[PDB]
Ligand binder design. Structure first.
Ligand SMILES: *[C@@H]1O[C@H](CO)[C@@H](O[C@@H]2O[C@H](CO)[C@@H](O[C@@H]3O[C@H](CO)[C@@H](O)[C@H](O[C@H]4O[C@H](CO)[C@@H](O)[C@H](O)[C@@H]4O)[C@@H]3O)[C@H](O)[C@H]2NC(C)=O)[C@H](O)[C@H]1NC(C)=O
Ligand SMILES: *[C@@H]1O[C@H](CO)[C@@H](O[C@@H]2O[C@H](CO)[C@@H](O)[C@H](O)[C@H]2NC(C)=O)[C@H](O)[C@H]1NC(C)=O
Ligand SMILES: *[C@@H]1O[C@H](CO)[C@@H](O[C@@H]2O[C@H](CO)[C@@H](O)[C@H](O)[C@H]2NC(C)=O)[C@H](O)[C@H]1NC(C)=O
Ligand code: NAG
Lengths: 140, 283
């Protein structure tokens, strides 16, 4: 018998969209959205890669930066260490690690300074829904 | 030869034509038979009183295949009840493409003329792929690949693994496997239900597709703290049963567990702004 050993690397498709309405029904297509600060924000993250049965979309950390650059030193974390932020009451999460979609809502804001644009950047970590317990329960 | 010839567009040279009296004494040079009559001369001595001739002729033997050059033939003539009673000298030459040329000579006497069978207008050349040259074997056109595509051993085999987000596929050049000596190949995963098929994106490929999960075609998943890998093995054989040189394609592609994601839509807030203006002066 002859064994040839070959391999490869693949990527999974995870998406993020702005919801035009609460309860996360319709997505947003426009290139720049113009709201008031008092208004809230409806966002969700989709998972389109595969094996949604064995995997659960789970949010580890997310933040806001004034620029498209994600590594901006000025970061307003919206989720800290798998936890919705406690010091700000207007932050709420609906599902995290529960299913293949992660969503959350928060009041809109503006970065203090000569900054007129806000960008949102999150980082996801998939998990095994049987091998490890993916429910994040956070308390101060 | 292939470029300097005179075409012949006539529909009465079929071996189905009833009867005529024309004879070809003024035919001099290289000719191509094109149209409803056919592209090749008759290969068997068609019975007498056919194809607009009292005594039909026929180029005896077999049509030369591609890359044969000048071939000398002695076209026979069917008359009086004896096939090949009179003889004429012809020089048939094959050409690139589904057509031929001949050195049509003057028969010894009139009431003699050539005529063509339907031949293989059904047998086409476009069915050969881009790396498959339009070669012929004893007059039948086939798709023989590049000669430079000649690999002997097994380790040098090409393998195109695409680790798609939802499915996984592995692709191998059909020309390479034909060169390796396998007329037909058998793709089989851990389960034989995942038999391979053909697909073309830039050439002839045989490919297998397996969903990226745990068990859809017996694929095994072993996830460590950083990556999750899908491992399955492919089996190569040239017949249903193997007798030597077992082949096992140990392929596996893994996915990351962490990734970065952001909106593609710009956000712009407006907040109530109070502007207090002050001033000063200095030296
Ligand atoms: C968790 O599992 C993952 C998935 O297997 C694993 O990542 C693997 O790390 C090993 C160790 O480095 C890689 O092994 C390969 O081994 C040979 C050299 O010995 C080479 O094929 C590889 O180097 C290649 O690196 C790049 C890959 O294209 C290229 O620059 C080039 O081809 C190099 O040759 C590599 O060292 C193995 O490839 C990765 N798997 C990947 C990258 O998908 C990880 O280490 C595991 N974590 C653990 C065990 O803690
Ligand atoms: C994103 O932001 C960083 C920080 O402003 C940009 O500059 C890099 O900064 C790091 C330290 O934060 C330095 O080590 C690098 O040398 C800097 N340059 C690069 C090219 O990384 C960085 O360029 C920005 N990235 C993009 C794509 O705009
Ligand atoms: C077909 O091919 C032959 C050989 O190339 C052509 O020339 C004939 O060659 C023979 C053998 O030397 C001579 O005896 C003949 O006299 C040549 N014929 C002529 C007309 O010069 C021949 O011409 C070709 N036939 C046709 C019809 O094109
Ligand atoms: C014509 O072909 C037949 C069939 O093989 C053969 O018997 C005959 O001898 C051939 N004629 C000539 C002149 O070679």
């Amino acid at each position: 018998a002859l064994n040839i050993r070959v391999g490869g690397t693949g990527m999974f498709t995870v998406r993020m969209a702005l919801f035009q309405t609460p309860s996360y029904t319709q997505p947003y297509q426009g290139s720049s959205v113009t709201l008031s600060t008092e208004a809230f924000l409806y966002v969700g993250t989709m998972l389109d890669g595969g094996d949604l049965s064995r995997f659960a979309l789970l949010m580890t950390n997310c933040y806001a930066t004034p620029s498209s650059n994600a590594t901006d030193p000025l970061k307003y974390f919206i989720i800290q260490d798998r936890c919705p932020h406690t010091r700000d009451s207007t932050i709420q999460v609906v599902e995290n690690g529960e299913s293949s979609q992660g969503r959350f809502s928060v009041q809109m804001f503006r970065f203090a300074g000569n900054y007129d644009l806000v960008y949102l950047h999150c980082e996801v970590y998939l998990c095994d829904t049987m091998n490890e317990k993916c429910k994040p329960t956070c308390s101060g | 030869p292939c470029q300097a010839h005179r075409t012949l567009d006539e529909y009465w040279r079929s071996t189905e034509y009833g009867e005529g009296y024309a004879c070809d004494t003024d035919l001099r040079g290289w000719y191509r038979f094109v149209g409803q009559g056919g592209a090749r001369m008759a290969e068997t001595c068609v019975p007498v009183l056919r194809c607009n001739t009292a005594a039909p002729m026929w180029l005896n033997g077999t049509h030369p295949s591609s890359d044969e050059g000048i071939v000398s033939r002695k076209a026979c003539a069917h008359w009086s009840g004896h096939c090949c009673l009179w003889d004429a000298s012809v020089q048939v030459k094959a050409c690139a493409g589904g057509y031929y040329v001949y050195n049509l000579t003057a028969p010894p006497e009139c009431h003699l003329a050539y005529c063509t069978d339907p031949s293989s207008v059904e047998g086409t050349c476009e069915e050969c792929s881009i790396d498959e040259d339009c070669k012929s074997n004893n007059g039948r056109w086939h798709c023989q690949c590049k000669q430079d595509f000649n690999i002997t051993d097994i380790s040098l085999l090409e393998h195109r693994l695409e680790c798609g987000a939802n499915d996984m596929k592995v692709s191998l050049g059909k020309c390479q496997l034909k060169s390796l000596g396998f007329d037909k190949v058998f793709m089989y995963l851990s389960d034989s239900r995942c038999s391979g098929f053909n697909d073309r994106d830039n050439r002839d490929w045989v490919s297998v597709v397996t969903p990226a999960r745990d068990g859809p075609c017996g694929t095994v998943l072993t996830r460590n703290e950083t990556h999750a890998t899908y491992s399955n093995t492919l089996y190569l054989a040239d017949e249903i049963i193997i007798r030597d040189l077992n082949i096992k394609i140990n392929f596996a592609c893994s996915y990351p567990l962490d990734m970065k994601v952001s909106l593609k839509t710009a956000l712009q807030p407006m907040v109530s702004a109070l502007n207090i203006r002050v001033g000063g002066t200095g030296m």
